[PDB]
Ligand binder design. Structure first.
Ligand SMILES: Nc1ncnc2c1ncn2[C@@H]1O[C@H](COP(=O)(O)OP(=O)(O)OP(=O)(O)O)[C@@H](O)[C@H]1O
Ligand SMILES: Nc1ncnc2c1ncn2[C@@H]1O[C@H](COP(=O)(O)OP(=O)(O)OP(=O)(O)O)[C@@H](O)[C@H]1O
Ligand SMILES: Cc1c(Cl)ccc2c1ncn2CC(=O)C[C@H]1NCCC[C@@H]1O
Ligand SMILES: Cc1c(Cl)ccc2c1ncn2CC(=O)C[C@H]1NCCC[C@@H]1O
Ligand SMILES: [Mg+2]
Ligand SMILES: [Mg+2]
Ligand SMILES: [Mg+2]
Ligand SMILES: [Mg+2]
Ligand SMILES: [Zn+2]
Ligand SMILES: [Zn+2]
Lengths: 474, 487
């Protein structure tokens, strides 16, 4: 039983939700968390979707080394100068000092791009589109939290190289849309697509696109996935060049993108859809969509007749026929785990050709005829998915509003909301917003489709260049 | 490709793995990039093994890569001989860590502390977890792409059971699955066996293994490992439960652990590769058939028609589940493509030219034999699928007969030494003592014209040991033991 309340102390509600759902176990190294099968299976569903989609775009899977040499990492600013403290360094094997220390990838640009330079000697050799599923380490400064901000995490990073800007620019938005599908269609989480401001964008790229999600219970936004156009910053840095097709002896630098998505997805799913009864799984990612619990031989045969029939309609179902646990225990158990539907069968319903289905999201008990099983259970699963998305949508609309001068901006921000405001775009101004609201508010993204069109000649909260989504964030 | 596999094995191997576009070199010694052509093979192995272990009830998870200094040293999980292979993170940025942290060389000390917390009663067993992950071992021995790399990808399975008989049954099920990966996927024959006392995982009860043979070097290699740990680790980490029906007794879990790595791909390369390059077994080839337009005089519409035919073969082949690629690139000649996909080891090259179209035929060329066949266009799905099956059987049959030729029996040290020096591995009567196995290693080095180590005690040796047979020292022999020079 979960005894914390998401409204009371978010930090202790989250800790008990991830542990009692058997998603997370704690490790003795700060910011490192064990992914138990319940959590890992969600990542695997995400991985199945994204991998298939990027494969349609021509991207191929690979695996590059985890260790990055001091020269390659230092080669040029993959990072900016402040990222250096988050890099973990190996300096010895056993008791023997390494001649030069080696770093654990915090990202793989500096591992991959020297090889890209070797593979590209003509425009024939482009595009290169590689993706890897792997683990990366960042010795994070902020307070660690499972799946939101971890010291080690799992991700996919995609790195693609092109002959022209226009090819690259198209992929950036293709990948971002796929990140948006993961959140919206898989995890039933609504997101805002946008571009990072000068201050918040990756210093190694030209522009950074992003999807931002909102976590009501904290009043904070969070970056869900990232898709950069690196332009020619890295190809100039690593000499990824090909020969001009028309002009003797003349070199062109490749255009590059890089994009990544992490297990942070699962934490956002938890923070958005979790309730005071525990985890709530969107059916699309639930490895168990229906759990069957009997409330011997006659009644179980009915339970297994339901479970074979549900498998026959491609529904992921588990029959919890264990005799060593009381039904009440099972109810609590699978509710904490967030199974979308509990299918209860008692002696009463069996004789009636009946059963009761309990949806995890709303709690309604539904009495359905036995014949009705595959058709009605799948209809409930799709309404749970739609219901979870609709509830989080209307929650996002409620907490994302518009203000046009600083005093109005703060009042909404202090009410636990994020707001789109007319913005200079300049770093000095964004710093000032950061400390005036302080607890300080950051820019989240410049939305592709802002709530309002910017008023003719409107000024920042210099003239305004764009409505920018601001808020307190992770 | 310049080098020849029989002349200089190391440079042939370096040339096959790079010109097949499997491997790229890194500036960290013993670390190698897995380009998509190699990684697709890993994915094929992964897809098979993963499905199989799920049938056995094993679940997938992911445990931290970092091992605290205290946890790694807290218990005797490994012999101190392994300490030099552990890589240590000692600082972030320029700030030294208060305590250094180790990179997982294996995950016992990370997992088993959590197993102890999760095991509170008999209800909590069995625990069967598997993780696909990367591991670091600062190898002293000569690193080689995929055979011995300082970072590698693997699967490690760790299971805990209430009873010994459950544990023991799984050890051999996993061993059998490893044997199916090598034999049915990679077409490599293997010898199942048990490791000698010297060669076993010191922390377990017994170690089973599959051993593979690489003829061109006359050297064997450990292809996969499956341990019964008994209760050695459950006692160290207190993975215990009280059976209420057995009041006053602590029930220590019976455990297994098992692992398989990207060494698989290197053995496949070494076993089936030839002087034209890689040879992929159809079962793991990410491209089973490459379609190449030939003979491209032709109007633009005619050329478009010939590409249309190539794409129609590609949809026909996809429709019966053959993995196919149409190399429709206009910037390379057909002859270039022939060589390119041969170096990559594609099982079947399907050539289509304009005369072939008008004739309603195509040409299929098998990578394993080089045989060219003219096939009727209507017969494409059935004939290509039949050839793919015969390639697979051909590759396994060749490597089988090669293993049979190079694995023989000797009952005297002098015969053992002579047979060994001919590039073979040998089953000999062996006492089993560690001192003796050391003796054999340095005598087979001294008296050679690299010492030989024990490979496994075969489950099914070639000959039965005679009553009162004595070892090749003077102690009696306990069992026929497979010996050889090894990677
Ligand atoms: N410590 C972390 N734990 C989990 N996910 C993370 C962590 N740091 C970054 N991410 C995620 O990685 C994705 C791509 O990595 P990237 O380098 O763009 O992150 P970032 O800009 O440093 O993120 P943030 O400001 O949210 O820490 C982001 O969309 C973010 O969701
Ligand atoms: N450096 C390595 N690179 C690739 N695979 C490896 C490496 N070391 C071990 N393996 C493989 O990992 C499997 C399981 O790991 P394990 O620790 O049992 O190996 P091991 O006994 O140390 O190996 P070896 O005798 O080759 O040194 C072995 O069966 C072997 O095939
Ligand atoms: C600590 C640190 C360093 Cl040292 C260097 C770059 C870093 C970083 N933290 C964040 N980035 C930026 C990136 O990772 C760019 C993109 N890499 C590919 C996947 C998507 C990702 O956004
Ligand atoms: C360097 C080093 C250390 Cl420091 C510690 C244990 C080691 C090791 N080298 C080898 N083993 C032995 C193992 O890994 C045992 C089993 N672990 C589960 C998967 C299969 C594997 O056989
Ligand atoms: Mg960061
Ligand atoms: Mg950022
Ligand atoms: Mg070893
Ligand atoms: Mg060994
Ligand atoms: Zn301003
Ligand atoms: Zn002996």
């Amino acid at each position: 039983g979960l005894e914390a309340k998401k409204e009371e102390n978010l930090a202790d509600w989250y800790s008990q939700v991830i542990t009692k759902s058997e998603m997370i176990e704690y490790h003795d190294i700060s910011g490192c968390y064990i992914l138990r099968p319940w959590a890992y299976a969600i990542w695997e569903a995400i991985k199945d979707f994204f991998d298939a989609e990027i494969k349609k775009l021509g991207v191929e899977n690979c695996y590059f080394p985890m260790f990055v040499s001091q020269s390659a990492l230092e080669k040029e600013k993959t990072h900016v100068a402040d990222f250096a403290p988050e890099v973990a360094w190996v300096t010895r094997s056993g008791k023997t000092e390494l001649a030069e220390p080696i770093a654990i990838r915090p990202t793989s640009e500096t591992v991959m791009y020297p090889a890209y330079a070797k593979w590209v000697q003509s425009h024939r050799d482009l595009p290169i589109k590689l993706n890897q599923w792997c683990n990366v380490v960042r010795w994070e400064f902020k307070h660690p939290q499972p799946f939101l901000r971890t010291r080690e995490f799992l991700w996919q990073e995609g790195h693609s190289a092109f002959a022209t800007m226009e090819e690259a620019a198209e992929e950036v938005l293709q990948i971002l849309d796929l990140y948006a599908q993961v959140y919206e269609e898989l995890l039933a989480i609504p997101v805002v697509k946008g571009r990072k401001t000068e201050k918040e964008k990756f210093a190694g790229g030209d522009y950074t696109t992003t999807i931002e999600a909102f976590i009501s219970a904290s009043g904070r936004a969070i970056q869900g996935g990232t898709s950069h156009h690196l332009g020619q910053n890295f190809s100039k840095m690593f000499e990824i060049v090909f020969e001009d097709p028309k002009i003797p002896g003349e070199k062109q630098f490749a255009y590059q993108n890089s994009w990544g998505l992490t297990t942070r997805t699962i934490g956002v799913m938890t923070m958005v859809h979790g309730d005071n009864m525990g985890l709530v799984l969107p059916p699309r990612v639930a490895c168990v969509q229906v759990v069957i619990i009997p409330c011997k031989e006659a009644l179980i045969a009915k339970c297994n007749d339901y479970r074979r029939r549900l498998l026959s309609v491609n529904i992921r179902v588990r029959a919890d026929l264990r005799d060593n646990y009381s039904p009440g225990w099972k109810f609590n158990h699978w509710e904490l785990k967030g199974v979308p539907i509990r299918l209860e069968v008692g002696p009463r319903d069996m004789k009636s050709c009946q059963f009761v289905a309990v949806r995890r999201d709303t709690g309604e008990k539904l009495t359905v005829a036995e014949n009705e099983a595959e058709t009605k259970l799948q209809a409930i699963l799709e309404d749970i998915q739609v219901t979870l998305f609709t509830r989080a949508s209307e929650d996002l609309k409620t907490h994302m509003v518009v203000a046009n001068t600083m005093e109005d901006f703060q009042k909404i921000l202090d009410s636990g909301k994020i707001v789109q405001i007319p913005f200079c775009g300049e770093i000095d101004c964004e710093d000032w917003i950061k400390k005036t609201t302080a607890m300080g508010a950051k820019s989240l993204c410049i939305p592709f489709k802002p709530l309002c069109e910017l008023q003719p000649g409107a000024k920042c909260v210099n003239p305004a260049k764009y409505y920018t989504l601001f808020g307190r964030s992770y």
